[PDB]
Design a protein around this ligand. Sequence first.
Ligand SMILES: *[C@@H]1O[C@H](CO)[C@@H](O[C@@H]2O[C@H](CO)[C@@H](O[C@@H]3O[C@H](CO[C@H]4O[C@H](CO[C@H]5O[C@H](CO)[C@@H](O)[C@H](O)[C@@H]5O)[C@@H](O)[C@H](O)[C@@H]4O)[C@@H](O)[C@H](O[C@H]4O[C@H](CO)[C@@H](O)[C@H](O)[C@@H]4O[C@H]4O[C@H](CO)[C@@H](O)[C@H](O)[C@@H]4O)[C@@H]3O)[C@H](O)[C@H]2NC(C)=O)[C@H](O)[C@H]1NC(C)=O
Ligand SMILES: *[C@@H]1O[C@H](CO)[C@@H](O[C@@H]2O[C@H](CO)[C@@H](O)[C@H](O)[C@H]2NC(C)=O)[C@H](O)[C@H]1NC(C)=O
Ligand SMILES: *[C@@H]1O[C@H](CO)[C@@H](O)[C@H](O)[C@H]1NC(C)=O
Ligand SMILES: *[C@@H]1O[C@H](CO)[C@@H](O)[C@H](O)[C@H]1NC(C)=O
Ligand SMILES: *[C@@H]1O[C@H](CO)[C@@H](O)[C@H](O)[C@H]1NC(C)=O
Lengths: 52, 259, 112
Amino acid sequence: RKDNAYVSVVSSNYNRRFTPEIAKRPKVRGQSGRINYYWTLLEPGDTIIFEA
Amino acid sequence: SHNGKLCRLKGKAPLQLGNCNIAGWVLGNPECESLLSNRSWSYIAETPNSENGTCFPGDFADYEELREQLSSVSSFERFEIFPKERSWPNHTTRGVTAACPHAMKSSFYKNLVWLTEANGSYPNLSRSYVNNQEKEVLVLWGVHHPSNIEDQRTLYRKDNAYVSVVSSNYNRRFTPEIAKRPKVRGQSGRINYYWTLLEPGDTIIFEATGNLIAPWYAFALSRGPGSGIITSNAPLDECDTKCQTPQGAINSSLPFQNI
Amino acid sequence: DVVMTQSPLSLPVTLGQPASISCRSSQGLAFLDGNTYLSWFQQRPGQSPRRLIYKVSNRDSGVPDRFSGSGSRTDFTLKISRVEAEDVGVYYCMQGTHWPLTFGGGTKVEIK
Ligand SMILES: *[C@@H]1O[C@H](CO)[C@@H](O[C@@H]2O[C@H](CO)[C@@H](O[C@@H]3O[C@H](CO[C@H]4O[C@H](CO[C@H]5O[C@H](CO)[C@@H](O)[C@H](O)[C@@H]5O)[C@@H](O)[C@H](O)[C@@H]4O)[C@@H](O)[C@H](O[C@H]4O[C@H](CO)[C@@H](O)[C@H](O)[C@@H]4O[C@H]4O[C@H](CO)[C@@H](O)[C@H](O)[C@@H]4O)[C@@H]3O)[C@H](O)[C@H]2NC(C)=O)[C@H](O)[C@H]1NC(C)=O
Ligand SMILES: *[C@@H]1O[C@H](CO)[C@@H](O[C@@H]2O[C@H](CO)[C@@H](O)[C@H](O)[C@H]2NC(C)=O)[C@H](O)[C@H]1NC(C)=O
Ligand SMILES: *[C@@H]1O[C@H](CO)[C@@H](O)[C@H](O)[C@H]1NC(C)=O
Ligand SMILES: *[C@@H]1O[C@H](CO)[C@@H](O)[C@H](O)[C@H]1NC(C)=O
Ligand SMILES: *[C@@H]1O[C@H](CO)[C@@H](O)[C@H](O)[C@H]1NC(C)=O
């Protein structure tokens, strides 16, 4: 329901903001959209914040 | 002991780049017209001080990785990926610059096309290419970063523009940046150059609303077992030796060397 | 002894085309003086053998320039750039380093 959106993942060692991109893509496995996957490793006593 | 001369190896002449480097060979520098012919070689020879590369200033993305890919290549086939006359009906394909001169004139690269507005309008662009050549295709393009907003408005008629290049292994989106820059080779603007390697059976899509230096010619690459890059100031001659150094050829059945 | 293997047994070539014969040995052929001592001979039908190549690279007097041989360690090759009508016959390789003296099997060249 919004044309502009953002994701932000903030930790004590990770700080990164992601913005969706809309374009024409070739069909892979019957789908033209994409999902980009990310990971991080939290330390003991640390906190992570997801905002979207 | 050595000959002191570059020469053939396993009956194949080397590719001698002369005063051109690898970037000026792949982009199509106007002083590198002799290298744009479809050939084969055994190893690549380069002058240690070559001054004919990217005539327009800018950054070449992953240049050393391109050198490492082009080290093990036996031959290429230069083919026209997008025709200049027919694939752009509603743009102006004529673009020259004073940073790249040919015979005391103004010219551009021989593998790239500078698209500009036609009749006061810059329509949306969307082109696709499919690979049927059964080998890898090296695709080269560029994104233009102007110096002021007036040049942007005169060339592309839009304050905001983007380029998107999408493949099955490449997915990138580029936005022009306008800033004040020092003058390099008489120009304050920049052109950033990018490359990719299509696989057989794959497709590439270029979409743009501004600031696109479109491809014109592409290279169909074939891989080989033994090749490399040598920096030399030694001259070409005729031999059939089985060892080559930057100093010269070596003919020994001896186990060691110190050259 | 030392076993020498030649490839191929028969090599039919057309006039004006290159040809190559390969000779392989079981042991290394280097000597303590610093040389290899491998020779290549030609035998025409109904005639005595004559020498073409002595040592790895040296070419005998009276031999045409189209005969060139090179190799090292255990693999050696004789190459003919242009094949003419006087290039028919059987070609052989010998070693002259180890006792006893061994000859090759022989490669026959025919014109197509
Ligand atoms: C070259 O490329 C560029 C970039 O790729 C292309 O640009 C794209 O162009 C699209 C149109 O072709 C455009 O899509 C429109 O988006 C508009 C905005 O959507 C929002 O608003 C609507 C409605 O909300 C209303 O209320 C709010 C709050 O007051 C207002 O702010 C809004 O303005 C509205 O009044 C929401 O539903 C959305 O969720 C968004 O919030 C749309 O309004 C617009 O819809 C109209 O056009 C449709 C197609 O004709 C039509 O079906 C629909 O009924 C709307 O009709 C309008 O226009 C007609 C004709 O003039 C008029 O008769 C109607 O009365 C009405 O005004 C579109 O959906 C993309 O956003 C845009 N992308 C960008 C900018 O990146 C460009 O087109 C392309 N050029 C070429 C060569 O094609
Ligand atoms: C190829 O390289 C030569 C130099 O090796 C370039 O010639 C120079 O061009 C600059 C302009 O930027 C002049 O200021 C120099 O005086 C020129 N030097 C000489 C010796 O002529 C030439 O412009 C390059 N060609 C291209 C197409 O970039
Ligand atoms: C190559 O071999 C020939 C013949 O043995 C010799 O004359 C020449 O000097 C050699 N080349 C070098 C660089 O030693
Ligand atoms: C370039 O390669 C193509 C093969 O796609 C060939 O048809 C053409 O003749 C070549 N051009 C040369 C050698 O100038
Ligand atoms: C170019 O302009 C013509 C004329 O309006 C139009 O028909 C065509 O769709 C445009 N685009 C292309 C890619 O030819």
